[PDB]
Design a protein around this ligand. Structure first.
Ligand SMILES: C[C@@H](O)[C@H](N)C(=O)NC/C=C/Cn1cnc2cc(Cl)c(Cl)cc2c1=O
Ligand SMILES: C[C@@H](O)[C@H](N)C(=O)NC/C=C/Cn1cnc2cc(Cl)c(Cl)cc2c1=O
Ligand SMILES: [Zn+2]
Ligand SMILES: [Zn+2]
Lengths: 402, 400
């Protein structure tokens, strides 16, 4: 099946209740998936030279009123009060990043400054419109903001595009639809600015040999955007990625830097998220893989199991070796038949089941079965461990052969 | 001068702002410290056999009223509304952990069930009382809840005590004061429940030769507790650790399991946090070390630097090797005097400074100096990486 709500219950990943609508309770195994996704995103953040920060959950309404989103989005925002002051719970991470940017004098030498965050966002969405991990009130955005010059825009958008396709390919998503939203009727800035900004987005797509289409007049008042729609194995469309140019917010929040000519200048801001919601993405992945998460993401990667009582100590040593090797491993030493053990952990979607009979113990080997029902044979212990490690390190979609 | 505020500005760790009172903006380098501390706690969670979960930011006021905290703490709650329903932003993670516990049938064979979370908590406390990272509104608790039988309590308190002392030791905190809070006047349970509960805490401490003082009548209505206070290098007291028994919240939130005699039993809950608050602990550590974070915690562990342009490629190759070994490393190829470079990174409190002259390139070596002003001379490059790797992975307090 491919129902994330069904699979999430079956594999004990998460649940949701009426007491907290649209907000996920991550169980151990789901939180393990979440944390590995974070680790993966972080490796891309380091690769693409992003800083990672953390901003507070709430900020004064007075500050949010200055952003120029208040009039359009006030209904979708949670608020809470303290000592005659009203605070918004953050629906976005951008203003918080500007605050960090505003600490200390910034120079042209500091640009481009790429500031990322796994940002916990809350949006007061209608309860009737909520649906599992897909449509949620509380979520974690794989967010970042690039502060750069006008001249630097193309190269930074280019880097964002690459990062998008790079990340989607890891999960097996090759069919990507790209849409470029152009100038709306109500907008800020000159027409010549919009020409350059739109052109920067289009040229950046062309340089990566990406065909796209327009979304005419669908851009925000503060700049144009690119949206990336991935397609799952059922050919269903999921809009996840976004790259949004912004010639408004930095000026609104008093962001500036010292240029090369020694003059004060306002930086351009690029908003981008690739996965979108980490929660929604996990939901998509769950259905894409039908719960058969690639080994690097699997809550339990390996179960080591004995055929009879005879191999219990061998199982313990091999389990410890896998533990030392960094693998998420469990020993199944229960007084149960080998078929019963295999069926259970197959249903739990454990990538590998390492079976130990007499002939395995005697040879210093292990019999490797996959959750797809494949028998890869009896293999040397050290050799299996190094192959498992390589499958995990490279985040491979495929299991071992034989 | 060991002010965490000052050191936080100097090393670009964090700042705070009037628009968000008592809530931290973690900058790159400060967030790196935080994440390493998180990784350290996770290693202990694994060692001590804890699950890790994440609960939602807010829940219904109806649920929070059932916990029995509402009359005592309603003024300290942050509340927000949606569709004519009031939601509390969470001050604690316990009720959310019960919600997870209540999914699926539990038995005695599942106990003890230890459920940990890095829980983002908010408490609406007087803004005037706030100061730095020590007194905040928004914080991250190294929280956990142990669901167990009455017979399992004593063993689980033992493991909690061991976890406390183990973790404090890692940071060099050996002077620990312990206080056991006994039954208050306003309490639930028979006197006999409290005799057993207080004895469970007392004996656990007695068997570990930990001396403690009683705190008469300062216990919760739902059970007694142990609090752990550490002392920094200036001999200031920091109450950080807590172990709190609870014979109330599980019943109140409809928690149960199938016992060994085939009947519904309400589990005992143990609350425990060790560091207390991640933000405050980082505050304490920053002051304890005066910015000289042990290498495993340091935002930037190594800076590799040249004398002239001649050695640039060797520095970059050496930098790449250090990065592959899992070390937070930065290259410094600037046209500046060696005394200038070494000073800047000594001021930034970078543990190690790797200097590469012509002698070092030709010989396949590197000249190592510490921020403490110790010249270790020209050493073999592989030998250095291994010793740095060991220092980081063992989380040593001392340098070479
Ligand atoms: C990529 C990221 O940096 C960017 N801010 C982002 O979230 N883009 C995706 C969609 C952005 C569109 N959107 C959606 N809902 C919102 C709700 C509130 Cl209450 C506010 Cl104040 C703003 C928005 C908003 O702008
Ligand atoms: C160890 C951990 O699980 C435990 N909850 C904990 O935080 N212990 C420290 C003491 C915690 C005591 N305390 C403090 N402030 C609170 C504010 C609110 Cl709004 C509410 Cl509803 C409850 C409390 C509360 O009970
Ligand atoms: Zn943004
Ligand atoms: Zn608690």
């Amino acid at each position: 099946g491919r129902d994330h709500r069904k699979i999430g219950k079956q594999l004990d990943l998460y649940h949701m209740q009426e007491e907290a609508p649209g907000m996920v309770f991550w169980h151990n195994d789901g939180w393990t998936i979440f944390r590995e996704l974070e680790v993966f995103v972080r490796s891309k953040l380091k690769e693409y030279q992003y800083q990672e920060v953390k901003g507070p959950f709430m900020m004064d309404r007075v500050l949010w009123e200055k952003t120029g989103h208040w009039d359009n989005y006030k209904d979708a925002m949670f608020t809470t009060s303290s000592e005659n002051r009203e605070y918004c719970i953050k629906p976005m991470n951008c203003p918080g990043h500007v605050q960090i940017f505003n600490q200390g004098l910034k120079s042209y030498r500091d640009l481009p400054l790429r500031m990322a965050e796994f940002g916990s966002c809350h949006r007061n969405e209608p309860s009737g419109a909520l649906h599992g991990l897909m449509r949620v009130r509380g979520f974690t955005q794989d967010d970042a903001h690039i502060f750069c010059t006008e001249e630097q825009i193309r190269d930074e958008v280019n880097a964002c595009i690459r990062m998008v396709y790079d990340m989607y390919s890891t999960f097996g998503f090759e069919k990507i639809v790209v849409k470029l939203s152009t100038r709306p009727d109500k907008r800020i800035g000159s027409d010549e600015m919009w020409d350059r900004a739109e052109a920067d987005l289009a040229v950046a797509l062309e340089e990566n040999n990406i065909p796209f289409e327009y979304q005419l007049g669908e851009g925000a008042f503060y700049g144009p955007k690119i949206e990336f729609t991935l397609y799952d194995c059922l050919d269903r469309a999921w809009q996840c990625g976004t790259v949004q140019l912004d010639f408004s917010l930095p000026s609104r929040l008093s962001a500036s830097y010292v240029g090369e000519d020694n003059e004060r200048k306002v930086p351009v801001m690029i908003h981008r998220a690739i996965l979108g919601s980490m929660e929604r993405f996990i939901g998509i992945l769950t259905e894409e893989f039908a719960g058969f998460f690639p080994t690097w993401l699997a809550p339990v990667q390996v179960v080591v199991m004995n055929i009879t009582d005879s191999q219990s100590e061998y199982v313990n040593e091999l389990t410890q070796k896998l533990q030392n090797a960094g693998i998420r491993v469990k020993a199944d030493l229960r007084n149960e038949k080998i078929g019963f053990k295999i069926r259970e952990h197959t249903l739990r979607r454990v990538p590998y089941m390492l079976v130990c009979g007499d002939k395995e113990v005697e040879a210093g080997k292990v019999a490797v079965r996959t959750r797809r029902g494949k028998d890869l044979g009896s293999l040397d212990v050290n050799d299996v461990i190094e192959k498992l490690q390589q499958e995990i390190r490279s985040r491979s979609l495929q299991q071992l052969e034989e």
